[PDB]
Write a protein that binds this ligand. Structure first.
Ligand code: ATP
Ligand code: ATP
Ligand code: CFF
Ligand code: CA
Ligand code: ZN
Ligand code: ZN
Lengths: 544, 145, 48
């Protein structure tokens, strides 16, 4: 009992389809370091996001493929976390310590920047303008040195912006680079995006990815550094070995002699060697991919706003919008708002169209009543020309309730009384009421749809097994059957840890089952995952 | 404590009229609908404060002339000369009054900033008056549902 | 109501076979059973 209780956390079990059609159970070992890195909370957040996008956003057909991609990405991220955990060489090691500190404290810098922006805006609240010397914009308050305090706050804010930029560059970009290299390698190995096929003209990313085809450092940040050789051996006969070599930037004789025997080079002694070791085309492609990231562009905008705030102190008020991306519920409510942004802009365009039609008819017939001047001898009409009539309607009639007719003169006492009444009533009902009703309903329906999405994801996960797909009703025949099955038999963490265990274990040490699973991982065949069957289902007659 | 204070001043007993909210069950149901998203509502009004503040900054920087709220020309009473009074003016008047902040402001026509003031007023009307109160309404409706 | 109509149509098509009417659960006993059945065995284009 004591041994089992001690090795319970380390003992992990999974189920596979197996070479024979009978479902089989595999027991392996889970490392303590692996479990700790898995229980890292960022891993939990990534798992939640992956589950949400694999349930709500479809992808059931490619469920196992997405799961395997998620496992690979998480392994890469936790390797990064392990690395960044707590003369020329001296400066280099000091630099790596600084970068590691920034990587570990990246989020705290973001929160500190938000607080700094709040403080700067609070100080700017006390501004005033005058004509006499302190026009003049001055910070007026009783206690002095407040302007020096604001200067110090601004300097600290920009220094923190630098730290956030460096932390993002050193923490988040490698995952994006890894994903892009993996996608490119898969495309040019299996689908042959560039061999026996050509990217489309609309594929801007496809055209941009053509740069790293010949660069020597193409397989950087990705487990496989032999993708070029594999593609050569796969498409050499059809496309031509020389053509493949020219496309991929390889040397046949060089690779052959390295396959036979190679020597060991010397480590870079100084900085000039690193300078000459820069691959310009690969770096340009890396810049091209990194600058397309939305978060990097937002951080650059933050930094540019801080630099402009140095020029003019009021530019720091733009950083108050950072709460929208900092606080999560801000993101939720603005996701509700932006879920139908195209709907809203198209609605306001339709509003512009109908208001334009009302301007045309009012210009044609209702010109007299648009006098907006109290002096009769100096009339100021706002519908004499089409431009001013359209501007008047847009600016005044839409904003003011009751339609356009409120600003217009009294229709009574003329021959067009009924026509003007119909005009005003139609404007009020079609512009003021119906269109703003659409505006309200779009937002309300967005809230409802997002709530329904979260509820659907939660219900689906609570009802169905993720790996097998069998409903909870079959397992709940036995007490706590579903709880046992989704925690002991088929566990996402268990499959992840088995993948890591296969990666770590030597090839000659793999047992029959481990080798049988391994071959398939490499051949990208997802048949070991038990879909529609389980150990209990197979051995119900034998009582498991 | 409210009853004891009502002994001191008779009008303090009016606070006991809110006891119906906790006495009548359907009062509790409707106020549960109201308070189911209380954090949502307070965070929405905070966001309203933030955006109104940004509009105050831009109006102070450029639209200072048009905020004269005095009928006497010889005694002008501007409400955006300083940041505090401009923010207070926007918060108190523009949010409550329909049609955006531009209704109280002077006529943009006849100046070089006509288009800029038109864009300012239209953006204020669409983002503050319409969208945010739409969120306020939708939160309560979704809570009932 | 319109959003519910679109969602209902999508869910019905994703769940039930159009020609047979048998639910996807019976076919999904075998891996990719529904995907095989709605693309190889009973296909609207095939009947056309
Ligand atoms: N094969 C499976 N592996 C894991 N969970 C499964 C599986 N099949 C179904 N589930 C369901 O997925 C649900 C997800 O819960 P989970 O264990 O991830 O919670 P948690 O660890 O508390 O979450 P969080 O990510 O918020 O920390 C489980 O409650 C379980 O019912
Ligand atoms: N007998 C059937 N024939 C065809 N589809 C069926 C049948 N029974 C059920 N279905 C379902 O109908 C769905 C309709 O998808 P379909 O194959 O028409 O997509 P598509 O060709 O991508 O669509 P689109 O018309 O937008 O180009 C399928 O995904 C399938 O699950
Ligand atoms: C299949 N596979 C991986 O998925 C992998 C890996 N190293 C890291 N990962 C994620 N190796 C060596 C591997 O063979
Ligand atoms: Ca062996
Ligand atoms: Zn299962
Ligand atoms: Zn069928």
């Amino acid at each position: 009992e004591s041994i089992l209780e001690y090795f319970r956390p380390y003992l992990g079990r999974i189920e596979i389809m197996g070479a024979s059609r009978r479902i089989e159970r595999i027991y392996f070992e889970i490392s303590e370091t692996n479990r700790a890195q898995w229980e890292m909370p960022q891993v939990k957040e990534s798992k939640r996001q992956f589950i949400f996008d694999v349930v709500n956003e479809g992808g059931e057909a490619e469920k196992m493929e997405l799961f395997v991609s998620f496992c690979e990405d998480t392994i890469f991220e936790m390797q990064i976390a392990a690395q960044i955990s707590e003369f020329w060489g001296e400066l280099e090691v000091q630099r790596v310590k600084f970068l590691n500190y920034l990587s570990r404290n990246f989020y705290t810098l973001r929160f500190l920047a938000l607080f700094l922006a709040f403080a700067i805006n609070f100080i700017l609240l006390f501004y005033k303008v005058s004509d006499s010397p302190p026009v003049y914009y001055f910070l007026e308050e009783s206690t002095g040195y407040m302007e020096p305090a604001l200067w110090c706050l601004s300097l600290l804010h920009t220094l923190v912006a630098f730290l956030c930029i460096i932390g993002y560059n050193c923490l988040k970009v490698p995952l994006v680079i890894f994903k892009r290299e993996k996608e490119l390698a898969r495309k040019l190995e299996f689908d042959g995006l560039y061999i026996t096929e050509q990217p489309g003209d609309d594929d801007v990313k496809g055209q941009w990815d053509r740069l790293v085809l010949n660069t020597p450092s193409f397989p950087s940040n990705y487990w496989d550094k032999f993708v070029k050789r594999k593609v050569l051996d796969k498409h050499g006969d059809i496309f031509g070995r020389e053509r493949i070599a020219e496309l991929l930037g390889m040397d046949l004789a060089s690779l052959e002699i390295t396959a036979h025997n190679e020597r060991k080079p010397d480590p870079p002694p100084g900085l000039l060697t690193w300078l000459m070791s820069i691959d310009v085309k690969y770096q340009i492609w890396k810049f091209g991919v990194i600058f397309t990231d939305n978060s990097f562009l937002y951080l650059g905008w933050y930094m540019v706003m801080s630099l402009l705030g140095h020029y003019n102190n009021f530019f720091f008020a733009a950083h108050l919008l950072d709460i929208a991306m900092g606080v999560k519920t801000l993101r939720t409510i603005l996701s509700s708002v932006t879920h139908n942004g195209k709907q809203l802009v198209m609605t306001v365009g339709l509003l512009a169209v109908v208001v334009y039609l009302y301007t045309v008819v009012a210009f044609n017939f209702f010109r007299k009543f648009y006098n907006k001047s109290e002096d009769e001898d100096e009339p100021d009409m706002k519908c004499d020309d089409m431009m001013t009539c359209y501007l008047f309607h847009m600016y005044v009639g839409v904003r003011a309730g009751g339609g356009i007719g409120d600003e217009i003169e009294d229709p009574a006492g003329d021959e067009y009384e009924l026509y003007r009444v119909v005009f005003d009533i139609t404007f009020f009902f079609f512009v003021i009421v119906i269109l703003l009703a659409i505006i309200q309903g779009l937002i309300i329906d967005a809230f409802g749809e997002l709530r329904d999405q979260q509820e659907q994801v939660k219900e689906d996960m609570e009802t169905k097994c993720f790996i097998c797909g069998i409903g909870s009703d079959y397992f709940d025949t036995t007490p706590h059957g579903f709880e046992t099955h989704t925690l002991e038999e088929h566990n996402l963490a268990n499959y992840m840890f088995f993948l890591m265990y296969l990666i770590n274990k030597d090839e000659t040490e793999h047992t029959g089952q481990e080798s049988y699973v391994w071959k398939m991982y490499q051949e990208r065949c997802w048949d070991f995952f038990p879909a529609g069957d389980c150990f209990r289902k197979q051995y119900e007659d034998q009582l498991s």
